[model samples]
Each structure stands twice: as structure tokens, then as C-alpha cells.
Target chain A: MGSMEAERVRVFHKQAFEYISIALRIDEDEKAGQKEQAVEWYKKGIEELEKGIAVIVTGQGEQCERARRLQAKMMTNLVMAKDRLQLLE
Target chain B: QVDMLLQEMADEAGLDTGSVGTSVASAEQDELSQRLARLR
Candidate 1:
């Protein structure tokens, strides 16, 4: 990938990670009284992480592998969160 | 009266909603969602 594209991917991944972290924290706020809201946040987090994963995956060489690994872990965490939210129903 | 006032404040602020409080998705996710759909 060109340097510019690489930078964009890095920024996107960082932002994605930030949002996911926030969503997870919101998920843990027992006083939030809005399980549906938390579920929505988790979904948003998953979407952002997925985009980051896509960008990273499309990159060249080691960059691609690194992005893949990161995306895989994020995806796993997202699935877990989604499953937990479903338990609330 | 004081107790009632505090309770009202909490409710409006959603502090009492616990973990399930209403919140919109982050702005980043908004853009990402669009991009994802375009990709598909």
C-alpha cells in the first residue's frame, strides 16, 4: 500500500479501537438501564472494527497479516458481546 | 422535595438507566457503516 493509504488505515484502526473500547465500557454500566442502547453501541463498535479490518486486510505483505490478526480478535470480542446482550432478552 | 428533584435529574440524565442507557453509535461507526455497505 502507498504510504498515504497505510496512514489512513492506521488512523482508522486506532479510531475503531477507541470506539469499541467506549462501547464495551458502556456495556458494563449497570446503571445505564438501557440494555438495548448498549447492544446498539456494541453493534456500532463491531461495524467500525470491521471496516478497520477490511482496510488492513487489503494492504500488502506483513501489513495485511497484522491487520488480519487484529481484526480477528476484535471480531471475536464483538461476537462475545453480542451473545451476552442476547442473554438479556 | 430535594429527593424528588435529585431523582428527576437522574432520570433525565439517564444516570439511573444503568448499563442499558440510550446512546447513539459513535460518529466513526456512522461513516464505517456506510463504507461497509458500499463494499458489499
Candidate 2:
């Protein structure tokens, strides 16, 4: 909950958002058969999100409400993408 | 009381509570918006 920890969480949250946004773009490229690429981005985004969640869960930061919500959204998207990949198989 | 109501509304709208309290840079917001638009 120190200032430094809070800042770290913020930076991680910001970066996670960036990755998730890119993953979303890749996910929507169905016309180009980019689901495989989209899965890669989603996995990467999930990695960032997991790091952010770990920071929050370990009590390293206090301002994590947004990070948790964003993580939820990212996980949901990842699940959807994985499901679509399965359907394509 | 008003804050509580606002929080409820935000939760219903699927908004992050910390995002409602924090401020993001305009440039960052603009970049994210553009990236999102390009996805469409």
C-alpha cells in the first residue's frame, strides 16, 4: 500500500489494458482467419492481467479495484476466444 | 449517499471502480480510443 507499490500497480494495470485492447483487435479479425493470432494476443494479455492481479492480491497495492475489473473483462474475452478456437476445430 | 448511488450505477454499467476515481491522460485515452476504432 505504499506509494511505490501503488504506482507499480497502476503501471501494470495500464500495460494490461494496452495488451487487452490489442488482443481485442486481433480477436475481431475473423475475416482474415486470425483466430490463432488472436489466441496468442489473448494469452499475452492474460499474462499481464495475472501479474496485475497478483500485485493486488498480495496486498502490494491499495488502488486495485479497476485492475480487478479489467482483469475480469480480459479473462472473459480470453474464454470467448478459446471457445471460438475450439469451435473452429 | 450520492457516491454510493454512483458506485451502484457504475457497477451496473460494468465500469471499474478505480477507473471512476482515477484520471487518465488525454493522450493515452485518445490512443486507446483510436486503437479500438481500428478494430471495427
- The residue-by-residue lDDT of candidate 2 on A1-89, one tens digit each, is 43344455456655555665566666676666545666666556556646654554334343454444444544454445344445433
Give the clashing pairs for model 2.
none
Candidate 1 regions off by >4 Å?
A: A2-9, A31-33, A56-60, B1-40
In model 2, which regions exceed 4 Å deviation? Answer: A56-89, B1-40
lDDT of 2 by residue, B1-40 (tens): 2364454344333366144333341233334445445544
lDDT (10s digit) by residue, model 1, range A8-59: 4445544454554555556556564564555666566566656655653454
For model 1, state the Cα shift of residue A76 in Å.
1.9
The TM-scores, one per candidate, come to 0.48, 0.48
lDDT tens per residue, model 1, B1-40? 2344454344334454111110112222333334333322
> Of the candidates shown, which would achieve the greatest lDDT relative to the real structure?
2
Q: Scored by CA lDDT, what does every candidate get?
A: 0.47, 0.49
